[PDB]
């Protein structure tokens with residue numbers, strides 16, 4: 248399992264953070280909350296976000312069915328763009344793909360995104376499909392890890408993960424509640440794709456990106472309420488408990504120590520950290536938990552600032568950033584994500 | 600990859616097809632359509648179905664949110680019942696599980712079922728999770744196929760697949776339009792679970808089920824409209840094209856020939872067929888397109904008649920039935936399913 252390509256895609260409509268806010272407080276039913284909205288938006292540490300729709304169109308997006316239908320169309324466009332890009336980076340072709348996995352939590356599609364995506368790209372009719380849905384924000388790391396699991400038993404194959412998250416589209420379910428307003432300060436739209444190859448196929452594809460060495464999932468007891476969707480007539484409504492950061496602060500070290508002990512590594516042996524940008528308070532929690540220097544998580548901070556929180560797609564944008572800035576050849580890399588479960592996922596990388 | 604435990608779980612309320620038709624024509628907004636309903640319900644070759652709610656409660660199930668909530672409450676219950684039954688069948692404990700795959704098209708759960716099930720039965724906090732959504736009626740075959748894919752590269756491991764379909768809970772989306780009435784004629788509620796182990800683990804636990812030898816997907820081009828959902832404020836509205844059978848008759852024989860040749864096998868080599876019970880027209884098409892004697896698909900016919908179309912769970916019930924019938928020791932087994940995509944999945948087995 249060696250990564251051969253990584254690529255991120257973004258919708259063309261980009262808006263500065265306060266632009267978004269300036270219009271948002273004026274949306275129907277939101278002006279009674281200008282103050283908490285401005286505060287929450289200014290404290291998100293996001294400087295701009297890409298929106299799959301013109302900012303001016305969101306107030307009229309009140310029907311879940313309308314929103315989901317648009318999701319299905321845009322999601323497939325962006326996912327195709329990402330996959331095509333990651334294949335370019337790997338210098339590979341659609342026909343070479345033996346297994347495709349898709350991750351999203353922001354739309355409901357049957358047939359799944361992989362069926363549609365594979366239809367658009369002219370993938371082998373016999374390609375193996377794997378649509379993950381319930382995973383959310385953790386599916387970027389967990390998805391890379393599922394690639395390894397597959398390629399571990401299929402050493403000559405090529406596998407891809409595609410992650411599309413169009414968070415702006417969940418708007419119909421947004422209420423002037425604290426947890427939904429937090430989601431309104433953090434989340435943006437985007438996609439990302441990873442092309443990965445088996446051990447036997449790496450050398451003759453000239454697979455560049457890092458090896459995928461291992462992963463470990465960590466599912467916390469009695470924590471369903473930390474992250475989720477309240478699903479209904481209104482669509483997909485965010486559940487976000489305050490206890491989230493406290494959870495990370497109390498258990499994240501053990502997740503990390505248990506996994507690295509297994510490889511006889513310490514936190515110090517990590518050459519590059521690739522963390523999910525849940526938001527200021529969550530990034531702080533990770534740094535505090537693992538006692539990391541301000542520079543360890545700077546590419547995730549940077550990511551949060553430039554494109555916001557992209558659910559599962561963010562950890563892959565950041566991963567691409569990390570690859571570009573060429574970490575020490577042969578050093579360890581750690582992917583660290585968290586999502587609905589509650590769970591965390593850790594992936595072990597080795598930079599080339 | 601060797602199967603070691605299979606197990607079906609059903610809701611307590613069983614009703615006759617006629618008990619169901621009789622109350623159903625009297626449901627709100629339905630009496631005007633009694634003729635077509637009685638015609639459809641009789642022609643389905645379903646004699647009874649298990650329902651997760653008391654028959655007479657459905658007229659009041661009009662809120663997609665209420666239905667999805669109920670789906671989550673009940674799906675987990677049924678899910679852990681099936682898994683437990685398969686583990687006991689396999690003489691294994693929940694802590695032995697290394698990866699759990701979940702499959703449903705009938706509810707929207709974030710956190711997913713596998714997380715909820717894992718929390719319930721006490722799976723290891725580090726169990727691998729694979730939440731498959733959008734495979735629909737093919738997820739029974741496909742799920743077994745991804746179990747091989749996982750165990751192929753983990754010969755000491757245990758991986759489980761848990762299917763749960765509560766079709767009756769999509770009632771809020773139902774209206775007296777044709778394809779939706781066809782649905783009310785065929786679909787029932789239920790769940791199933793498969794427990795499989797790696798080759799090396801096989802001898803230790805003495806796995807008795809069939810070997811999982813190979814699989815082949817077959818995605819049909821430009822056929823996304825054949826079946827799926829139309830997701831909206833009202834939930835999950837069925838899309839079922841009339842063209843479905845014609846695609847089966849046109850291309851199924853080839854799907855199987857290309858797949859069997861690769862093993863130097865002929866239809867006549869197959870000792871037991873485990874086919875998805877789409878409904879009468881579908882079963883016939885399969886029998887017809889291939890050249891199968893009436894007895895070849897009888898277990899499918901019996902399952903259809905006995906508990907309805909359980910979506911992805913059916914072929915696992917039918918697998919359970921087949922295992923019990925004990926086909927020729929050492930003979931070939933072939934699973935065949937079809938679903939949203941449009942696609943088919945074939946899985947080669949070898950009985951003991």
Ligand SMILES: CCCCCCCCCCCCCCCC(=O)O
Pocket residue numbers: 298305352353382383384385414415416417418421427430431432434435474475485558559586587
């Ligand atoms: C223009 C509006 C943008 C903000 C979007 C509205 C609020 C979205 C709230 C949730 C969106 C993304 C949530 C994903 C969480 C997860 O990955 O599990």
Ligand SMILES: CCCCCCCCCCCCCCCC(=O)O
Pocket residue numbers: 623657704734735736737766767769770773779782783784786787826827828837910911938939
């Ligand atoms: C009284 C309620 C009886 C049952 C009502 C059935 C409503 C029809 C909808 C069921 C559709 C299930 C389709 C799943 C299979 C698939 O999508 O591939």
